[PDB]
Amino acid sequence: GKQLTILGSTGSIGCSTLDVVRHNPEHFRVVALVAGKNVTRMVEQCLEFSPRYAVMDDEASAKLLKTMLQQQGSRTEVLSGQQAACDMAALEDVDQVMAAIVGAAGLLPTLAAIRAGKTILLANKESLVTCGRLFMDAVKQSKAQLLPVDSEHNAIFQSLPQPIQHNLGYADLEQNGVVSILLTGSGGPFRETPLRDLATMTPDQACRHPNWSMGRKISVDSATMMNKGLEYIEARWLFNASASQMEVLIHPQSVIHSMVRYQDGSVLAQLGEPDMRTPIAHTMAWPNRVNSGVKPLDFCKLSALTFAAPDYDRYPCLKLAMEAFEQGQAATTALNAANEITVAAFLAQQIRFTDIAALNLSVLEKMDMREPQCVDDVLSVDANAREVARKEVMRLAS
Template identity: 45%
Template sequence: MTVVSVLGATGSIGRSTADIIESQGETFTVEAVAGGRDAAALAAMALRLRARFAALADPAGLPELRDALAGSGIASGAGEEAVIEAASRPADIVVAGIAGSAGVAPTHAAVRLGRTVALANKECLVCAGEAFMRDAARAGATLLPMDSEHNAIAQALGRHTADDVESMVLTASGGPFRTWPAERIANATREEALAHPNWSMGAKISVDSASLMNKGLELIEAHHLFGVPAERLSVLVHPQSIVHGLVGFRDGSVVAGLACPDMRVPIAHCLGNPHRLATAAPRLDLAAVARLEFEAPDLARFPALRLAIEAMNAGGAAPTVLNAANEVAVAAFLAGALAFGAIPRLVEETLERMAGRYGSDAPRDVAAALELDVEARRIACEIGGIAAKLTD
């Protein structure tokens, strides 16, 4: 019996994780589930998975959560400390599926306890990569990449080390705007940005995928996760989303990870590690697919990716600021307070405003990274004339 805790249980990662857990019979038991603001959805997930503890990030939802769980024997709590408790309770695997920088502190709590963490929150390594990886090594924690691209690369990498790697390529579908001209992209609506062609995801990551910022954040994550220098990392647009990642080795060989676009595949790989779990995910039929297309990303039409690459190359505080400003800009766009084309402009202006303010070193620890995150958010709101409440 493998004990699992699921952070971000009500999101797309959490729901797919629940599907895998339920499909495996008595293989898994669930210690804790954590969610954001939807008390009813969290209670339903806790009951569905027979969790021992449920934590809601929003304290205002605690009465509703308790009422929904009354008589079930499932303990509950709300607020930041409750979510950290969910992450800290005894578990063999902690699924880190809380989106954005909100997932950094609870995921870090699990890492500091030496847990095995299935990492679906890229912001942990974008916001505080050096400190996060250092703390994981000190605590003996194991990080299993759950993002489809990083999971594919981990499988392609196998037992090889970064010294054997000549290149790592993350693929991007290109999102809903892959063939659009720049002017049309700049004026894209909320509904258009959320209409991803291949994946069903939450609103924030869907917008990031439309701007290609998501792929830039994933490059920074890969840099820390696999210890590969920034100059060996790149992005390739692949509209079919069949090839998820490629590793080029110094002998000239290239190994790629392929699968149908279904998050149950990397989730099952992490939960079953080091074994393979059977899933109901669709099987890849290359004859039916017939053609696999690849193209270089257009950094002029998708400046968000350019900004992320520049932040990765700059290092230091730049990735932390990049992530914070992007979260502010995306939240404002989703709230109707910012145009789609203004997202990368706000991120770039925030980076320029904060350049040099914190020196060339990365944040010394996770707490310092989160302090910088708060400051970058404040400045991004100030630059964009955005009310802070829109970005909560």
């Protein structure tokens, strides 16, 4: 069937991807698995999926993996480091690359796949949040097919016409009858919290999403709507959408995953169970479909679906991200990096919930960097913004 390289195989998206292959063993052959330090999970994945190669970024991890696969009788070839990860993404016989490495580390392996003209199942945030200009230029150049894995972008992609789906990132929305892209977001645990009380919210309260169970960092991004601000940046790049072609809508139940408004009045949407195997199986099978293991959405067991307009006084981070987009990749890169710093400080009880947006803004004000021209330039902006942000945190706590 299709030959896959999975970048970040041991993480949450990687495991979900492998479950899709598990459900479809005649449609997908795992050629290469790439991870960072989780040797234990990597051994089990090598023993199940029989890849030609397994790469650990960490050298000690690669050495341990080799000894365990040997002890277990597997002939999977073990590589290490970043060049090896890029080589797997670029293998002549692979069809699809699941781009699921977390952070700036996912950037060069992702680009290797784009440069090799692969089908990219895109689930690394930094690719378009930080490198949207560079990566979209590179996709046009190699004719790589991007297929977004993130639930919102995937929902938009499924609700978009064929000429846009082929040509993703270069097609013209208006020419294809599209008025706007409707990005939906839960609004987080503090949708109805009095504004006064936001300053005193605790990490446990911020991470206590009534509709989720997720990592703490992304839980907090959901409470601030920084997570939607970042998807807004990705969406503008992915779908070639101007600011007037984007709408952000609060949808508390998260049943509708996002939508697309058309010239005749029609709105197309994707709905489903909250399970990343759906969007992953969509991207792996496109333009066809496969079983993902996800059960059919039961419309008789739903909460009523509601929508509201986001209030920028309640979600300053959402506005910041929209503004940062206008200023360029140095600003979006800086916002992303600042935000990692400030959220981790919030979680470590070094700053208040409301300090996240105020410090993110403060970093952006302090910076003026010029437009990145390559991945080294973005990495440099990211590194600088983190330092600015860590000093801002220390100031507040001191």
